Structures are given as C-alpha cells and as structure tokens.
RNA sequence: CGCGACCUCAGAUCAGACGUGGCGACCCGCUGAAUUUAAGCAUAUUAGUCAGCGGAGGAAAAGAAACUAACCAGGAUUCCCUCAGUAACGGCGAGUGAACAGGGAAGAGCCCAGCGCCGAAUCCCCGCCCCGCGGCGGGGCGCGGGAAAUGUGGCGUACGGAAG
C-alpha cells in the first residue's frame, strides 16, 4: 500500500529468515583467535618468513584491472627452469609453485626470473646438522644475524 | 485381579513400600525443607495407572 | 530330482551354450587340442616349469 | 551311484567343536547368590513364633531368586538341621517368605533358641 | 448411553508396560510400544515433538557409563597405572 | 598388456561377441538371487581402474536393482496439494541406479566399505551392478599406507553420504560455470550461504 | 577389630576366604539381632561388617585379577576383561605403528627433498 | 565306477575379527508439503524450507580444473567484504536472483589403473626363540599353511615419463 512518492522496493524477507541469521558477535574473539594462532605458527617456524613462501609478479586478468600487478599463486615451471631452481626443491626451500600457470609473454617471465634470482641471492639457508655444513649452506656469520621478516616477503608494488 | 503376574505384583510391591509417610526424625535436620510426604497416594483417589 | 538352484543354473547355462548361436570368437575355444598332442606338449612343458619357492 | 528319493537333501557335513584360542572372560563369575546371601533373616511375628512352636517349622525371608531346593540346602548348611519340606510365597512387600518344615527328630524351638529368635 | 453408562464397560485394558521405555504404552494386540516402538530396533523418536525428545535424552537418567567416560576423558583415558604409594 | 585389449572389447558392445557375452551373463544373473557374493570380478580391468587390487580383503558383490523410474509412494491417486504436485506417474529419482545399488549393498554389509562400483549387464526390467567392498579391519588393508585411508572413521559408509563415483555424479558439483549452485561444500551449503543475513556488529 | 586393606594383601587365599566366612556369619547374627531388637551397638555394627565384607572381597578380586593379567602378560590373545577398555573408536583406531609406517614413494621423497631451514635477509 | 585338479556353491557353538543401537546444535544423501503472498486463484511465492528417512566427524562436505576468462591474462577447495539486490528468471505480476574479476582469512600438495621393465622382486596367517609389551609390534628360524599371473610390490601419472 504505497504512499505518495518514494522508491518501490523488493525486500528479500519473504522466506523465514530468523532461524538463519549469522550474527557477528564473535568478531573480536575470532580475531584474537586468529592472531594467537598466527603468533604460534610464526614462532614455530622460527627463522622462516611468517608470510610463508614467495609469490610471483602477476598481472590481473581483465580489462578493468590489467594495469595493476598483484601477488600471484606460485612461480611457474618455465621461470623455474630458467632460474635453475628445481621443481621439487623450490617449495622445500620456500618458493611457491603452481604448474598450472602458462607464460604467454616474455618480459613477465624475465621479471619473475630476476625476482627468483634476487630471492636466491637474499636467502640465508641453514645447514641441516649444525655440526657439519655442506656446500650449499650460508656462512656462520650471517647465520647469526638471520631473523624473520614480517609481512609478505619482498613486497610487490606496481 | 487375584491372578497377578510377577512383574505387576513386583510393581505394586514397590509402590506399597513408597506409600508410607515421612519419618519424623527428619524435620529436625538443618537444611530441611520437607513438611510431609507430598507424593502420597490414596487408593480411592488416584488409580496408579497400570 | 529337484536339484538345487545352483546346480540347475550351472547345467542349463551349458544347455544355453549349446542352444544359442555362439559367435566364432567364442566358438574357437571348444575346437580344442586333442589328447595325444596335448600330452606331448605337456611332457615338453614340464621341463621348463618356473621355480618352486 | 543311484538316488532313490527325488529330493536333493543337504549333505550332512562335519562341525568341529569350539577350540577357543583364549577364554572370553578370564575369571569365572563368583557365586553371588550363596548360602549366606540366600537367607536374610527369620521372622519374629506372633504368627511366626506360634508356627515354630507348634508346627515345628521355621519362618525365614529369602531373596526372590531362591528355590525350595536352594533354601533347604542353605538351612542344612547353615544350621546343620535336616529339612522335611519348604513352602515359599512372595509377600506384598516383595521378599520371598519361606517356611522350612524340619525333620521330626529336630525341634525348631531349640533351633530358634540356638540362633537367637525368641 | 453414549456417556456415563458406557463408561462402565471399560474393564479390559489395551496397553501395558513396555520393556525399553518403561511407560505404559506397550499395546497388547499390535504388540508394539506407543512411545518407543518396542519390536523395532530403533527408538521411536520424532522431531515434531521436542518435548517428547526432552523427556528422555542422554541427560535424563543415571548415565551410569557416560558420566564415568566424561571423568575419564578429563585425564585422557589412563589405564594400568595407579598413583605411586606412600 | 591385455587390459587395453579387453577394455576396447568392452567398448565395442554392439559387436555380437560382446552381445552374446552380456546376454548370457544377464540371463545367469537374472536367475541368481538379488544380493550374492561374486567371487571375482566379471570385469577385471574396470575393477582395477576403480581400485580393486586383487588381494586379500577386497570382495565384490553383484546386485540387482529393479529398473525403472519412481512413482510417488502415495495412496491411490491423491497427493493432497496444489496442481503442480499432483502427478505421480512420470516422476524420476535423483540418484542413479548405480548409486542405489552400491547403497543397498553397503547397507547389507555394515562391516565393509564401498570403494566404487561398475556395470555388468541389463535387461528391460533389471540392471546389474558389481560393487567393490573393502574389509577395513583386515591387515593386508590396514598395513598398506596408500589404502589405509579407507580404515578411518570419517569414511564410514561412503555410499550413503554419497561420496563414491555414482553418488558423486548426482550431487551436481564440480568446477565450472555449470555448477554455480553448489559452490561451498554442496548444494545445501550453497543455499545456506546465500539465504542468510550477515548481520554485522557495526552494520 | 578394625580390619583394613593393607593387612590383607600378603594374606594367602584360604585364610582370606575363612575371614570372609566369619564376617558373613557375623553379619547374619547381627541381622537376627536387628529383627529381634538388639542394641544400638549392634545396629551400628552391621555397617562395619558390611564394609568389612566389602574390602575383603575387594582384596580377593584385586589379587585374582592381577595374577590373571601377569599370567596373560606375554601372550597375544588375552581376554576381553584384560584388554584395554578405552572408548570404542579409540580401540578401533589405527595403532601407533600403522599410522607411522610410510610408503616407499613418500619416504624417498622425504629423503631427497626435506624441508630446509631458511631465513630471508631484509 | 573310482581317484585327482580347478570352477561355482553350501555348512559349521570352526580360528581371529568386524557392523548393529544412542545423541543429532553444526555436517552429508534422499524425500518433501501446505497455511502464506499474488488484495481472488490454478503458474509462480512460501520452498529444496517444516515434517519424514538414512549416515558420519570433532568438524563434515569440498579440493588440486574436461576451470575462470578473451585480458599485457589469472590458477585447488573453503570463509569474509564487494561484485548486487546487478546480469537473469517471473500470469515479466507479486516476487525471485547468482557468477566472474578485485581486496582479504588461510595456504600443501599428491596417488593409482593403463603404457611398460624387473626370475611375484609382494601380502596374510600359524609354530619356536630373543626384546618390548594398557595402541600386540621389531628381529631370526621354519622341505609351515595360504593369497596372488583372472596381476601383488618397486619405478612411474599429464607439471610428462622410462631406458641407454
Ligand atoms: Mg496512509
Ligand atoms: Mg472409583
Ligand atoms: Mg483390542
Ligand atoms: Mg530413528
Ligand atoms: Mg502452483
Ligand atoms: Mg573427499
Ligand atoms: Mg552425467
Ligand atoms: Mg606406486
Ligand atoms: Mg568362532
Ligand atoms: Mg548409527
Ligand atoms: Mg491469496
Ligand atoms: Mg487477503
Ligand atoms: Mg482464498
Ligand atoms: Mg521452489
Ligand atoms: Mg527458490
Ligand atoms: Mg527436516
Ligand atoms: Mg563421536
Ligand atoms: Mg574430509
Ligand atoms: Mg589434474
Ligand atoms: Mg576460484
Ligand atoms: Mg549498489
Ligand atoms: Mg500480466
Ligand atoms: Mg574470485
Ligand atoms: Mg595475509
Ligand atoms: Mg603394476
Ligand atoms: Zn516402550
């Protein structure tokens, strides 16, 4: 029974919605739950980055967004085989991999290749048993000054 | 029904033992809120089920 | 006699393999090697048996 | 061979005995209804004392899983007196009253003075 | 004789006590219980009566096994040990 | 290997070799009862590619679902309701007869767990499915790491939650734009995210 | 006097059953004294002898079942009373060996490609 | 006729195991209305909802593309903000109504059958000895019994892979 002037509208309340209403009163309890879990995870992987692995330079898909570069899913196999990092060793030393990515361009591939080689120049890899280092381990001086870095490892800005 | 079965007669035995009143040494206790046996049952008034 | 149902079905399955037009790809297995050649082949084959455990 | 009857019967097979590699429960159950828990006490009513005085019986109450045989075995083991017969009933309270008529060489007034009821 | 003089003929009963629910609802002629459905393997339970669910669920009776399994869970189901004596 | 040959053979079904085979098999299975143990699979390649590794602990049943649609189990005509909901004769059931087959076989064996299931034969009035069951308390299963997943309590009665291939094909899920009405866990999880108010604290 | 369950464990079996028989006899005499109408001392005492019955039977059943389980200690099929009676799903759980044993695929993967111990310079 | 192999199929108070039933707030599968709204009502709406039935777990389900896109392309699932009350459905009436892309929470990937190649290289069970034994496991011994060639194990799975 509409009155004089005003938007005619269709509120979607014709179902029985009061038996199903998700109320957000555990919002701050859920945030403190998540950040206590995040602190526990970040101190149980003790020198490793808390943000997890490194994730590649990726341009957004569609016409609205292709001028913005965001962090992707994982490094593709082609830029891994150009950077000389082995497929199964990349995620075990901290480089995220998805094989599903193509590389139709060349300069984005070389940007990811340079980004991987920058990561391998930057990381400090500990020897597996501390009493006996091997050839692919960092020096015991920079082992002393290794620490976590907060936030995403090598932040990606356009 | 003087042809009772055993389960019925046992059930009646339990309710006949429950029908006795309160023992009078209780209402001198400390945390007592009991004054008489409320769950009593007269055989004319309530017919027990069964 | 009134046989059990498994004896009845396993005989009249053979009766159906005699009744129906068996295609030649299944017919070729009943045209079988005869006994005085088969015992020849088996006394040859008994020499090259694979090893017991 | 030959079949005579036109009905196929099941061939009677061999069935072995139970040879269990371990017992199910380890200890056998201790007899919870024994000669002390079978009779609880005797009665001291005026009818019960008049019956032990005259009819040479005893008046006990027992738990309801008894037998007449179990009651007479119990009295023969507990008071060393021979029992002629046993009459059991279930009282409206629910216990099983038993009437233990003795052998005539024993006297139940002497047994009652022996076991305390007077 | 629809009423008072037909209430006199009520002398042979229909229901009696069941052996699973204990209520007087075991029918004699059908021989199935009314509240629990005795010869059925499963407890008669419907969601159109939350009150008939609340009258006998896990919290109602003695919980002879299940309060014990609660206090065993709160130490994590230890067995075979006794505390060291004095 | 032979299994490529016999799988091409089973793909050629109107060939009269296979027509004779599945007609005689379908006769034998029609004669035999509704739920009996097959001792070994009729189709070993499809058994193996569905998961039957022929060792101790896997059994195979051969069950007969009665073929047809589903008329509405309602008294004589009489669906008491509006005229959209009158019709009872031409209604069809949401799950495939393969899923009904593995369902009632996994019901009849409560101790065993449905791995998958496959087809063996059909006539006008029945269809026949051989369903693979795993005994999860047998130790050739339990000590094998890549198949001790079936021995966990979450995989209890897969055929009735609808987690096998035949139950999976009737829940309407999978990646795509074709399956928008199931994203979330399932169809009802889709419905349940969609039809709730998220009343925030600050609105 | 005050019977207790540290004075009963080195006691041998037949004199424990003799002690049990004497306590049963004393309980029966006290029940006859109850129904006849005895002293308040005896009406007190029947709880003492019921708990005396109780802890003698406790000592008997404990020393029986301990001997049973150190008889069935080394054996492989021990009875259902003597097996671990934890919850049903926790008995039907996979054991500490079968949840631990890994296939050769993933154990050679865990050999060749282990998780390393890395840290990224800022 | 008998004896013996196998194939189908029975019987066991056989040896060892296993399922049943309960609760059901959250989860999964099926079934599934009508009051109500349309100022009537029949399609629609209520509603894949209440009722019913089966089945679980500490979470379930989902999940590592037979995908989204059409761009300088993204990249398992799940959840939140947003897309949006939009595209769209609807006696186009009342009403219904997603998804992509973006930002976040979290982040982990893998394995068979087939193709093959290795003297079945594989597994279960009994007996004896040693160790540990309240998650019945480790080692040796067996001219001990079975399973398995109608195919177990090792390598190997779409990111290719194997051999030389
Ligand atoms: Mg107005
Ligand atoms: Mg009256
Ligand atoms: Mg009647
Ligand atoms: Mg029910
Ligand atoms: Mg309609
Ligand atoms: Mg799954
Ligand atoms: Mg389909
Ligand atoms: Mg493998
Ligand atoms: Mg047995
Ligand atoms: Mg259940
Ligand atoms: Mg209307
Ligand atoms: Mg109106
Ligand atoms: Mg109207
Ligand atoms: Mg609808
Ligand atoms: Mg709708
Ligand atoms: Mg419901
Ligand atoms: Mg549980
Ligand atoms: Mg899961
Ligand atoms: Mg894939
Ligand atoms: Mg996505
Ligand atoms: Mg808007
Ligand atoms: Mg119109
Ligand atoms: Mg998106
Ligand atoms: Mg983050
Ligand atoms: Mg192989
Ligand atoms: Zn009942």
Curated annotation (Swiss-Prot), chain E:
List the protein's name.
Large ribosomal subunit protein eL37
GO MF term set: MDM2/MDM4 family protein binding; rRNA binding; structural constituent of ribosome; ubiquitin ligase inhibitor activity; zinc ion binding
What does the record give as the function of this protein? Component of the large ribosomal subunit. The ribosome is a large ribonucleoprotein complex responsible for the synthesis of proteins in the cell.
Q: Which organism is it from?
A: Oryctolagus cuniculus (Rabbit)
Example of a GO cellular component annotation carried by this entry: synapse
List residues modified as N6-acetyllysine. Answer: 9
The answer on whether this UniProt entry bears the keyword DNA damage reads no
Subcellular location(s) of the protein: Cytoplasm
The record's keywords, sorted A to Z, are:
Acetylation, Cytoplasm, Metal-binding, Phosphoprotein, Ribonucleoprotein, Ribosomal protein, RNA-binding, rRNA-binding, Zinc, Zinc-finger
**Gene3D superfamilies per UniProt:** 2.20.25.30
* Entry annotated with the keyword RNA-binding: yes
The lineage, from the top, is: Eukaryota, Metazoa, Chordata, Craniata, Vertebrata
Report the record's Gene Ontology biological process terms.
Answer: positive regulation of signal transduction by p53 class mediator; translation
Q: Which Pfam families match?
A: Ribosomal_L37e
Swiss-Prot record, chain F:
Q: Does the keyword Manganese apply?
A: no
Please give the sites of covalent lipid attachment annotated as N-myristoyl glycine.
1
Region Disordered, annotated ranges: 164-185
| Cross-link named Glycyl lysine isopeptide (Lys-Gly) (interchain with G-Cter in SUMO2), sites | 82
Q: Which Gene3D superfamilies match?
A: Ribosomal protein l15e
The record's subcellular location field reads: Cytoplasm
Pfam family name, one: Ribosomal_L15e
- The annotated regions of Basic residues compositional bias extend over 168-181
- Keyword field contains Ribonucleoprotein: yes
- What domain of life does the native source organism fall in? Eukaryota
- Example GO BP: cytoplasmic translation
**Which cellular component terms (GO) are annotated to the entry?**
cytosolic large ribosomal subunit
Keyword list (alphabetical) reads: Cytoplasm, Isopeptide bond, Lipoprotein, Myristate, Phosphoprotein, Ribonucleoprotein, Ribosomal protein, Ubl conjugation
Instruction: State whether it acts alone or in a complex, and with which partners, per the record.
Output: Component of the large ribosomal subunit. Interacts with IFIT1 (via TPR repeats 1-4).
**What protein family is recorded?**
Belongs to the eukaryotic ribosomal protein eL15 family.
* Record-given protein name: Large ribosomal subunit protein eL15
Q: Which gene encodes it?
A: RPL15
Curated annotation (Swiss-Prot), chain G:
Role description: Component of the large ribosomal subunit. The ribosome is a large ribonucleoprotein complex responsible for the synthesis of proteins in the cell.
Q: Which organism is this entry from?
A: Oryctolagus cuniculus
Q: Where can this protein be found?
A: Cytoplasm
Alphabetized, the UniProt keywords read: Acetylation, Cytoplasm, Isopeptide bond, Phosphoprotein, Ribonucleoprotein, Ribosomal protein, Ubl conjugation
Cross-link Glycyl lysine isopeptide (Lys-Gly) (interchain with G-Cter in SUMO2): which residues? Answer: 24
Query: Pfam families, from UniProt?
Result: Ribosomal_L29
Q: Where is the composition biased (Basic residues)?
A: 85-95
Please, which domain of life does this record's source organism belong to? Eukaryota
Give the organism's phylogenetic lineage. Answer: Eukaryota, Metazoa, Chordata, Craniata, Vertebrata
PANTHER family per the record? 60S RIBOSOMAL PROTEIN L35, LARGE RIBOSOMAL SUBUNIT PROTEIN UL29-RELATED
Tell me which residues bear Phosphoserine: 28
> Is Acetylation among the key words of this record?
yes
HAMAP family (UniProt xref): Ribosomal_uL29
Which Cys-Cys disulfides exist here? Answer: none
Region annotated Disordered sits at 84-122
What's the protein name?
Large ribosomal subunit protein uL29
GO molecular function (one): structural constituent of ribosome
Q: Which InterPro entries match?
A: Ribosomal_uL29, Ribosomal_uL29_CS, Ribosomal_uL29_euk, Ribosomal_uL29_sf
GO terms under biological process: maturation of LSU-rRNA from tricistronic rRNA transcript (SSU-rRNA, 5.8S rRNA, LSU-rRNA); translation
């Amino acid at each position: 029974a509409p009155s004089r002037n005003g938007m005619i509208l269709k509120p979607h309340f014709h179902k029985d919605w009061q038996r199903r209403v998700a109320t957000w009163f555990n919002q701050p309890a859920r945030k403190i739950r998540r950040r206590k879990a995040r602190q526990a995870r970040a101190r149980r992987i003790a020198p490793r980055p808390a943000a997890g692995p490194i994730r590649p330079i990726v341009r957004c898909p569609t016409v609205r967004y292709h001028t913005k570069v965001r962090a992707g899913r994982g490094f593709s196999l082609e830029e891994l085989r150009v950077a000389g990092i082995h497929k199964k060793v990349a995620r075990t030393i901290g480089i995220s991999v998805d094989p599903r990515r193509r590389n139709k361009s060349t300069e984005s591939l070389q940007a990811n290749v340079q980004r991987l080689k920058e990561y391998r120049s930057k990381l400090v890899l500990f020897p597996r048993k501390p009493s006996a280092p091997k050839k692919g381990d960092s020096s015991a001086e920079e082992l002393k000054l290794a620490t976590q870095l907060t936030g995403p490892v090598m932040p990606i800005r356009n | 029904s003087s042809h009772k079965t055993f389960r019925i007669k046992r059930f009646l035995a339990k309710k006949q033992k429950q029908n006795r009143p309160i023992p009078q040494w209780i209402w001198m206790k400390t945390g007592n809120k009991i004054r008489y046996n409320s769950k009593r049952r007269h055989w004319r008034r309530t017919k027990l089920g069964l | 006699v009134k046989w059990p149902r498994y004896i009845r079905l396993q005989r009249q399955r053979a009766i159906l393999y005699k009744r129906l037009k068996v295609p030649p790809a299944i017919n070729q297995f009943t045209q079988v090697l005869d006994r005085q050649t088969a015992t020849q082949l088996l006394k040859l084959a008994h020499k090259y048996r694979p090893e017991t455990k | 061979k030959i079949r005579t009857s036109p009905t196929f019967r099941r061939p009677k097979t061999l069935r072995l005995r139970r040879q269990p590699k371990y017992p199910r429960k380890s200890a056998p159950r201790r007899n919870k209804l024994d000669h002390y828990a079978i009779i609880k006490f005797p009665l001291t009513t005026e009818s019960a004392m008049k019956k032990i005085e005259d009819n040479n019986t005893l008046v006990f109450i027992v738990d309801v899983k008894a037998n007449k045989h179990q009651i007479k075995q119990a009295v023969k083991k507990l008071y060393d007196i021979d029992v002629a017969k046993v009459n059991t009933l279930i009282r409206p309270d629910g216990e099983k009253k038993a009437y233990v008529r003795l052998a005539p060489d024993y006297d139940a007034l002497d047994v009652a003075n022996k076991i305390g009821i007077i | 004789t629809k009423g008072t003089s037909s209430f006199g003929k009520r002398r042979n009963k229909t229901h009696t006590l069941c052996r699973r629910c204990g209520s007087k609802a075991y029918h004699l002629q059908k021989s199935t219980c009314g509240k629990c459905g005795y010869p059925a393997k499963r407890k008669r339970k419907y969601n159109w009566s939350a009150k008939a669910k609340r009258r006998n669920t896990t919290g109602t009776g003695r919980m002879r096994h299940l309060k014990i399994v609660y206090r065993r869970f709160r130490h994590g189901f230890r067995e075979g040990t006794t505390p060291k004596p004095k | 290997g032979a299994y490529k040959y016999i799988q091409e053979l089973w793909r050629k079904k109107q060939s009269d070799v296979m027509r004779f085979l599945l007609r005689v098999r379908c006769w034998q299975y029609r004669q035999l009862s509704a739920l009996h143990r097959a001792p070994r699979p009729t189709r070993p390649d499809k058994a193996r590619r569905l998961g039957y590794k022929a060792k101790q602990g896997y059994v195979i049943y051969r069950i007969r679902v009665r073929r047809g649609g589903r008329k509405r189990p309602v008294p004589k005509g009489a669906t008491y309701g509006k005229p959209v909901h009158h019709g009872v004769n031409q209604l069809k059931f949401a799950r495939s007869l393969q899923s009904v087959a593995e369902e009632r076989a996994g019901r009849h064996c409560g101790a065993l767990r449905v791995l998958n299931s496959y087809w063996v034969g059909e006539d006008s009035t029945y269809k026949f499915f051989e369903v693979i069951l795993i005994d999860p308390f047998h130790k050739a299963i339990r000590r094998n790491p890549d198949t001790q997943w079936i021995t966990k309590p979450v995989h209890k009665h897969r055929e009735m939650r609808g987690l096998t291939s035949a139950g999976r094909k009737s829940r309407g899920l999978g990646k795509g734009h074709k399956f928008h009405h199931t994203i979330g866990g399932s169809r009802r999880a889709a419905w349940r995210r969609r039809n709730t108010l998220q009343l925030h604290r600050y609105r | 006097a005050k019977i207790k369950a540290r004075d009963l464990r080195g006691k041998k079996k037949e004199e424990l059953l003799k002690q049990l028989d004497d306590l049963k006899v004393e309980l029966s005499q006290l029940r006859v004294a109850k129904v006849t109408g005895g002293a308040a001392s005896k009406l007190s005492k029947i709880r003492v002898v019921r708990k005396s019955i109780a802890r003698v039977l406790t000592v008997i059943n404990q020393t029986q079942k301990e001997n049973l389980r150190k008889f069935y200690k080394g054996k492989k099929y021990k009875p259902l009373d003597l097996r671990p009676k934890k919850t049903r799903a926790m008995r039907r759980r996979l054991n500490k060996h079968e949840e631990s044993l890994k296939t050769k695929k993933q154990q050679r993967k865990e050999r060749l490609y282990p998780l390393r111990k890395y840290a990224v310079k800022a």
